[PDB]
Structure 1
Amino acid sequence: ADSDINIKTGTTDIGSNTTVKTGDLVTYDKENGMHKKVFYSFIDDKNHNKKLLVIRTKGTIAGQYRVYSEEGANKSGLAWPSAFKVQLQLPDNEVAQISDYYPRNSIDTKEYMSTLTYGFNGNVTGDDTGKIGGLIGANVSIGHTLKYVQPDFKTILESPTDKKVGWKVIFNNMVNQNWGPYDRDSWNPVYGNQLFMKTRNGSMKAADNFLDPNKASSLLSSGFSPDFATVITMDRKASKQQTNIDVIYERVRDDYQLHWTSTNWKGTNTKDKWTDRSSERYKIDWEKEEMTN
């Protein structure tokens, strides 16, 4: 921080004595079940070498955990979101550039623990027949414990360039009714993948043996709300002070199938089966300081 380098907190930050122009752009894609809101801020700090535009991509992409297919009482399929993505793209001819973005990738951590135990014991026996016994034991042990946290979804900043940045919130793993956790590659030779299986044996049909969405992660059904920030810089001396930018919301869905093997239920998951892409273009006016679509 600024204090770590003996500087007055806030001395190097942008934005002081600047009239900031902000705005809201809301769109709803019915075909793709996506509420998309862009919140923009134009900062023209005369003491800074470039103009800035901070774009915040928010709103919410519905989960859409659905039993889309049912081939009889013995086979049924479920579509579930395995990934949520938001991307911003400036055409390559553009002179404006992506400068900063938030959040970024974090270094994970784990907790390590080692234990060395060693004891001794002595036992003295005997009985009514005047017998007498003994026992002198010894022992050593070495335990290793590893501890770490596992979010249900991971938020990853995808490698940016000066014209493109994007985030993806991917399915990590989940606890199905206290067991598991199970993930996209979970496999049991008997039950197959058990991610969204309600019961392992059941006289019910297939469409009725999928996990209750109220019992799974809330992003799977209700949805995920993005809240990412991208900073775009523009040179004051540039000849074109109008910039096009495409923002793309996206949902990647997997295909989880259940089926009766006559004795038990078997589940299978096909990765990245479908992709719902909601794309849109906005125009940035650096002179009037307003974004439109």
Structure 2
Amino acid sequence: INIKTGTTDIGSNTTVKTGDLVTYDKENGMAKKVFYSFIDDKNHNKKLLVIRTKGTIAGQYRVYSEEGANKSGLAWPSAFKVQLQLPDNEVAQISDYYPRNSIDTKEYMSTLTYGFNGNVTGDDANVSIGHTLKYVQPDFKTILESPTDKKVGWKVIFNNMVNQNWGPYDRDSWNPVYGNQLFMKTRNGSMKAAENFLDPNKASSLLSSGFSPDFATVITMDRKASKQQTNIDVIYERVRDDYQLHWTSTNWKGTNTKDKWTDRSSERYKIDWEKEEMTNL
């Protein structure tokens, strides 16, 4: 892509060594790309590591069940989560993360720079490193989760949605006749439940296709520290709700159980600050 790998001198006796890693999780419908950047400033007491987490999480919007023509279930992704976590015994600390706060915009973007003070600062502080964050979240919201020096996590959760001019609806919508009409195609149509689900092409590309995260986590590591190797766990995660259409005696009625299924993908990475390398275990 536009993300280069290699080593550049970004000035003031500072080097940016960048590499990449890829792991396919075909079971969970996940391609998990990681671009890492070692910012080694000879004038700073700490080496910096930017872990740009990328790839694709397929939405896997699909009809999973059918009981005659009066009942059917639907699995739809209600949340995409990326998390990074450092075990407790480690010396390394999470100094910074992007997005830094909640993002309600359908598009997020940020260009990461190094300010030669040991601080990575995002704008949308002088010279750029090779990363410009960009991701899209139609009908979705981004939320930061319990950030500490040992764990950071982003949660891209479903917000609201217009349903062929009926909407807007969310996971909590209710109607005394039709219940939750989120993905309900027709209110009184004559067809099998399996066929009365909204076309995913008429909705968020996070539902039909999927979500492509682009988050940066910054890790600081003291040079004088004894143990100069570090483990870090990176988790990609999909939460899928269960939307069921049941034919009542008169009309169609929808229900939505939250967070019924959660598919969790996890990889461990060895960080070597001296060799400035990142590898899978």
Deviations 1:8-67 (A, max 9, x none): 999999964323211110011011101100100001101122000000000010001110
Unpaired stretches in structure 2, ≥5 consecutive residues = none
Q: Which runs of 4+ in 1 moved over 2 A?
A: 5-19, 106-128, 138-151
Aligned-pair CA distance for 1:114: 36
Aligned-pair CA distance for 1:229: 0.5
Aligned position for 1:162: 149
Aligned CA distance change for structure 1 residues 191 and 286 (closer, same or farther; 3 Å) = same
1:127-146 alignment to 2 at 5 Å? none
Deviations 1:103-159 (A, max 9, x none): 12259899999999999999999999xxxxxxxxx9999999999999611111112
CA RMSD of aligned residues (A): 16.6
Unpaired stretches in structure 1, ≥5 consecutive residues = 129-137
Sequence identity, in percent? 99
Please say if residues 137 and 206 of structure 2, whose CA atoms lie closer than 8 Å, have aligned partners that are also in contact. Answer: no
Please point out which of 84, 89, 110 is paired with 1:88: 84
Please say if residues 36 and 278 of structure 2, whose CA atoms lie closer than 8 Å, have aligned partners that are also in contact. Answer: yes
Please say if residues 42 and 52 of structure 1, whose CA atoms lie closer than 8 Å, have aligned partners that are also in contact. Answer: yes
Aligned CA distance change for structure 1 residues 117 and 188 (closer, same or farther; 3 Å) = farther
Provide TM-score, normalisation by structure 1. Answer: 0.80
Over alpha carbons, which structure has the higher Rg?
1
Aligned-pair CA distance for 1:287: 0.7
Please say if residues 15 and 45 of structure 1, whose CA atoms lie closer than 8 Å, have aligned partners that are also in contact. Answer: no
Aligned position for 1:238: 225
Instruction: Give the Cα separation in 2 of the matches to 1:141 and 1:225.
Output: 23
Give the paired residue count. Answer: 280
Please say if residues 56 and 230 of structure 1, whose CA atoms lie closer than 8 Å, have aligned partners that are also in contact. Answer: yes
Aligned CA distance change for structure 1 residues 267 and 39 (closer, same or farther; 3 Å) = same
Aligned CA distance change for structure 1 residues 208 and 100 (closer, same or farther; 3 Å) = same
Please say if residues 110 and 147 of structure 1, whose CA atoms lie closer than 8 Å, have aligned partners that are also in contact. Answer: no
Aligned CA distance change for structure 1 residues 163 and 189 (closer, same or farther; 3 Å) = same
Instruction: Give the Cα separation in 1 of the matches to 2:122 and 2:98.
Output: 75
1:108-147 alignment to 2 at 5 Å? none
Deviations 1:63-115 (A, max 9, x none): 01110111111100000111100000111000000000011225989999999
1:1-293 alignment to 2 at 5 Å? 16-106=12-102, 152-293=139-280
Aligned CA distance change for structure 1 residues 18 and 168 (closer, same or farther; 3 Å) = same
Aligned-pair CA distance for 1:276: 0.3
Aligned CA distance change for structure 1 residues 261 and 81 (closer, same or farther; 3 Å) = same
Deviations 1:171-228 (A, max 9, x none): 0010000221100110001011000001111111000000001001110121001000
Please say if residues 159 and 170 of structure 2, whose CA atoms lie closer than 8 Å, have aligned partners that are also in contact. Answer: yes
- Single out whichever of 141-150 and 221-230 deviates more from structure 2: 141-150
Aligned CA distance change for structure 1 residues 231 and 15 (closer, same or farther; 3 Å) = farther
Please say if residues 241 and 258 of structure 2, whose CA atoms lie closer than 8 Å, have aligned partners that are also in contact. Answer: yes
